[PDB]
């Protein structure tokens, strides 16, 4: 292929044309000092810290900007380059405030580290230091703008990755100021990432403000559970305390960003958390009791009952191990009526084929696509990183986004085809204009969010999408490898439950009111005590005591995602396993352990007593639940569409509106979100 | 001149390089690598089998009278196939010079005892066995020296936890100082101080 | 002198203490300042090196001239924030005099 020969410190390296000096240095292994350069963002060249010497060149060039030329010897560690770095660091530090003892970036400060390595050891600035004002930018980010290095990283992130375009550089000269000119609240589902962006602890988190230091905190790698995207996470902990949540890089999903919910709802783990088993709802006084008492009573009731009288409702943020173990328990009791709160149509192929309930195109494939058709979604406020990927495509790989939903601000420009369901049939018949855009397209995407499927017409909308997407496949030549049907999920555990074989929806409970209910981490209130008999011995396995637990006979404390190495599968089918970061609070235990102990106290006894054996049973139920960080391919959507064609329903005339019309809606959905206080401040601010 | 930079000389470096070549060519059978550091410290690496020959040569040869054994140490490097790296430091009073001899070993690979050459070794070798677990053949009396009378481990190994596995206390029931598994009120705080940026360009390992 | 506590929970003393005796947990007060909810020194683990008062950026932690504080029980030697602040208040005048005498040498 076409490559150029360049030298770094007299050593040859081949680089594709246009690669920057910084990128060639990275290739050879050297890491040039930088501040204003971010690989995800655009190039700025403002800091001038990456200045380097090209040999036999008179003037030092900026390594982050210069696209290398052939036969260039990049003298990284020349006297010229070192003195350039010295001068740049001097000017950076001249006006800085004396805040290192009182600065959240204390131990991680790149300014500190690069002054240490590539910086002088003495100051010769014998004048006064500039002073900048602070301005409330919202309830989440606190701005100490006196210590800005004016690097414009926050502005570039705001205008590119988020599209908010609220932040800017106002003024000129040393009196420059990076911030909103008016008193505005910087509120984006991706706002928090600015905190990690900015390299001089200027704009930092109000919640976490001043708690711990990097040399203290212990970091364990975990996967988010507050959204179906499964954004990889690092949980910073001290002495069992969860200090903060930080992004972990995963090119396919995270790309070094995380949602504000994901990074600021951790506080919910601290308030109103379960700790002790409880019993005695009949008398009305739900009191604490020993594991012996609670488990024995549950096992006794289970022995009394059986068949279709028992059932369970898994929902929200429950894990695959707990799901499979409860499924095994209820099946050994002879049931199969275990259900999930979320509603996915079961009229046709249902859950038998993963091609029906998955994002086949994959978030990575969202970049490759050319026309994406959004139906029944407000993707900005549900799976925000998916919207981030779409905006990335729109900005770089020019893409056309067409939406069949209420007009919302998806950050990018979208062709609001209509807010009606029969528009899908219009496209399928070819009556609509957007069909011409399809004919143009060589890689189409039709993405359908579970939000609409929750409607009463879920089967009708699913069949409409299926027929329309098959029509797209036949009319527009699409390679068999490329998948054009994909589904967006807003609940973390839905895909895992369906892969296991849980019955989607809760129609079974209402059709046959169970005598005993097993509410597993479900406080959605979909099944209230109004249904079921006058006494139904409802048992709650979960955490945070949301509100759904109260109206249950016995409460068994569980562990949140920060304390258990659960298996969580994201919307694209990939399996990711959390890592224990904090021991479960008080007496709380892991859910698979809980269910196995309950069974053994009962006559039944599950085959497994360890995480390895539970994972083996998981592999048994489905094989893709144990291939971690792997996206197993799906097919036979042809057969799915055949069954969908046979399925007979009709799309209502009700306008299709996404549940989340505003960030106020986004900021509280889960139990942890409801129990978190910072989210309350955010919602209050947005409301006013 | 540069007041804060350590003064440098090359005479000693040249002399040590000459002596390094000298020893290497005298003993090609065991010598495997000779290097003179910028600090000016001749450093010979020999095959484990050549310990007795090399040390006897350095002690007895007229042109090399390294009659005093300063240390007999071990450095643990878990990654390398031979974890333990025995270090011998010697001093020649006649020639005002110091030399270092280095060899490798393994848990299952004993090295010969040099007590015959320098009887100073005996106790250093006992410490090496006690702390790192390396065994020495033909040693007069090899036995634990710095560890407890019933200790089960080689503490200086990098795998060994700092606080160990066993703690002692008195128990009135048995009227003896009993040993129990280690439990700590405030566990050791391992601060992560490594800086993301690289510091010393010379020692940059290739990627 | 107003009454405010000098320590601003920078935690450099904790970071440097050779014996790992200092344990600090701080939170942002109502105003927004750094203040230590708990500041605990285990005086049976401390080696009285002085590296804490060496590295305290605001001269908050200081090793007073007192040397007579033998206790009758092991649990009295685990100093806490209240005990340390009371010691500082008690020895303020002499601590201040020594600091003025010495600061030039430091």
């Amino acid at each position: 292929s076409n490559l150029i020969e360049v030298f770094v410190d007299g050593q040859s390296v081949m680089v594709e044309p246009g690669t920057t000096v910084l990128q060639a240095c990275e290739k050879v292994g050297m890491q040039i000092p930088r501040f204003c350069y971010h690989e995800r963002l655009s190039v700025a060249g403002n800091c001038r810290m990456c200045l380097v010497e090209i040999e036999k060149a008179p003037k030092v060039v900026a390594a982050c900007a210069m696209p290398v030329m052939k036969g260039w010897n990049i003298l990284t560690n020349s006297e010229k380059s070192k003195k350039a770095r010295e001068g740049v660091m001097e000017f950076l530090l001249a006006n800085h405030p004396l805040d290192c003892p009182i600065c959240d970036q204390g131990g991680e400060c790149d300014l500190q580290d690069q002054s240490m390595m590539f910086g002088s050891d003495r100051s010769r600035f014998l004048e006064g230091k500039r002073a900048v004002e602070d301005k409330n930018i919202g309830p989440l980010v606190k701005t100490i703008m006196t210590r800005c290095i004016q690097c414009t990283r926050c502005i570039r992130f705001a205008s590119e990755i988020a599209g908010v375009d609220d932040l800017g550089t106002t003024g000129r000269g040393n009196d420059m100021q990076v911030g909103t000119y008016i008193e505005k609240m910087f509120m984006s589902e991706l706002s928090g990432n600015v905190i990690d962006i900015c390299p001089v602890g200027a704009l930092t988190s109000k919640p976490y403000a001043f708690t711990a230091r990097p040399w203290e905190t212990r970091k364990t790698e975990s996967i988010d559970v507050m959204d179906a995207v499964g954004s990889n996470i690092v949980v910073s902990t001290r002495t069992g305390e969860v200090m903060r949540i930080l992004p972990r890089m995963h090119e396919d999903i995270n790309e070094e960003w995380i949602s504000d919910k994901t990074r600021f709802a951790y506080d919910g783990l601290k308030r109103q958390r379960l700790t002790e088993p409880m019993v005695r709802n009949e008398k009305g006084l739900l009191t604490y009791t020993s594991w012996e008492d609670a488990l024995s009573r549950v096992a006794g009731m289970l022995q009394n009952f059986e068949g279709n009288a028992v059932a369970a409702i898994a929902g929200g943020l429950v894990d695959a191990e707990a799901l499979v173990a409860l499924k095994d328990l209820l099946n050994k009791v002879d049931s199969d009526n275990l259900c999930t709160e979320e509603i996915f149509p079961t009229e046709g192929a249902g859950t038998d084929l993963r091609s029906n309930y998955l994002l086949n195109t994959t978030i990575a494939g969202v970049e490759e696509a050319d026309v994406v058709l959004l139906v029944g979604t407000n993707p900005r406020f549900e799976a925000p990183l998916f919207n981030a990927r779409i905006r990335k495509s729109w900005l770089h790989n020019d893409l056309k986004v067409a939406l069949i939903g209420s007009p919302v601000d998806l950050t990018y420009r979208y062709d609001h085809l209509g807010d009606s369901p029969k528009i899908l049939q219009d496209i399928a018949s070819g009556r609509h204009s957007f069909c011409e855009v399809l004919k143009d397209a060589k890689k189409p995407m039709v993405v359908l969010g579970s939000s609409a499927l929750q409607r009463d017409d879920g089967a009708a909308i699913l069949v409409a999408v299926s027929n329309m997407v098959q029509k797209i496949r036949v009319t527009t030549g699409v390679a068999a490898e490329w998948k054009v049907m994909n589904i967006l999920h807003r609940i973390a555990s839905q895909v895992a439950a369906l892969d296991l074989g849980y019955k989607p929806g809760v129609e079974a409970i209402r059709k046959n009111p169970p005598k005993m209910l097993f509410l597993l981490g479900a406080d959605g209130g979909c099944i209230t005590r109004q249904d079921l008999p006058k006494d139904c011995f409802i048992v709650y396995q979960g955490h945070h005591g949301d509100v759904g637990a109260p109206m249950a006979d016995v409460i068994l404390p569980g562990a949140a995602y920060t304390e258990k190495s659960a298996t969580y599968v994201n919307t694209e089918g990939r399996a990711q396993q959390t890592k224990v970061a904090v021991t479960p609070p008080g007496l709380a235990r892991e859910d698979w352990k809980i269910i196995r102990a309950l069974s053994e106290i009962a006559g039944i006894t599950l085959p497994y007593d360890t995480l390895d054996q539970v994972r083996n049973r998981l592999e048994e139920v489905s094989p893709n639940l144990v291939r971690y960080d792997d996206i197993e391919e799906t097919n036979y959507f042809q057969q799915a569409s055949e069954l969908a064609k046979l399925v007979n329903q009709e799309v209502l005339a009700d306008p299709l509106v996404p549940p989340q019309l505003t960030i106020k809606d986004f900021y509280m959905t889960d139990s942890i979100s409801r129990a978190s206080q910072t989210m309350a401040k955010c919602v209050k601010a947005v409301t006013e | 001149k540069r007041p804060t930079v350590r003064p440098r000389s090359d005479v000693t470096h040249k002399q040590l390089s000459a002596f390094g070549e000298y020893v290497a060519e005298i003993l090609p059978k065991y010598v495997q690598q000779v290097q003179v550091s910028c600090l000016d410290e001749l450093e010979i690496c020999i095959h484990p089998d050549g310990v007795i020959p090399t040390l006897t040569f350095l002690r007895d040869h007229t042109n090399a009278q390294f009659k005093s054994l300063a240390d007999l140490t071990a450095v643990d490097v878990p990654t390398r196939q031979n974890r333990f790296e025995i270090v011998y430091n010697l001093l020649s009073l006649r020639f005002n010079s110091r030399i270092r001899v280095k060899t490798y070993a393994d848990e299952l690979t004993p090295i010969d005892s040099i007590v015959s050459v320098h009887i100073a070794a005996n106790w250093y070798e006992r410490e090496v066995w006690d702390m790192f677990g390396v065994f020495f053949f033909n040693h007069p009396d090899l036995r634990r020296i710095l560890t407890d009378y019933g200790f089960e481990g080689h503490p200086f190994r990098k795998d060994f936890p700092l606080t160990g596995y066993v703690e002692l206390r008195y128990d009135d029931e048995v009227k003896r100082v009993v040993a129990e598994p280690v439990e700590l009120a405030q566990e050791f705080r391992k601060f992560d101080l490594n800086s993301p940026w690289e510091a010393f360009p010379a020692y940059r390992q290739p990627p | 002198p107003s009454g405010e506590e000098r320590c601003i929970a920078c935690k450099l003393c904790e970071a440097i203490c050779p014996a790992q005796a200092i344990t600090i947990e701080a939170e942002p007060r109502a105003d927004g300042s750094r203040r230590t909810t708990r500041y605990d020194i285990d005086m049976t683990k401390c080696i009285y090196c002085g590296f804490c008062q060496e590295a305290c950026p605001v001269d908050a932690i200081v090793e007073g001239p007192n040397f007579e504080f033998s206790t009758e029980t092991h649990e009295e030697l685990l100093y806490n924030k209240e005990k340390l602040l009371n010691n500082g208040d008690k020895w303020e005048a002499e601590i201040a005099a020594n600091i003025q005498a010495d600061y030039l040498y430091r």
Binding site: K270, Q272, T275, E276, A549, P585 | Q186 | -
Partner: peptide, 21 residues
């Protein structure tokens, strides 16, 4: 004992237990 106030006890966590309505 249980406490609505989250307590940092030595090296431990005690979250806001919250007496259940």
């Amino acid at each position: 004992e249980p406490s609505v106030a989250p307590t940092s006890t030595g090296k431990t966590f005690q979250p806001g237990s919250w007496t259940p309505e």
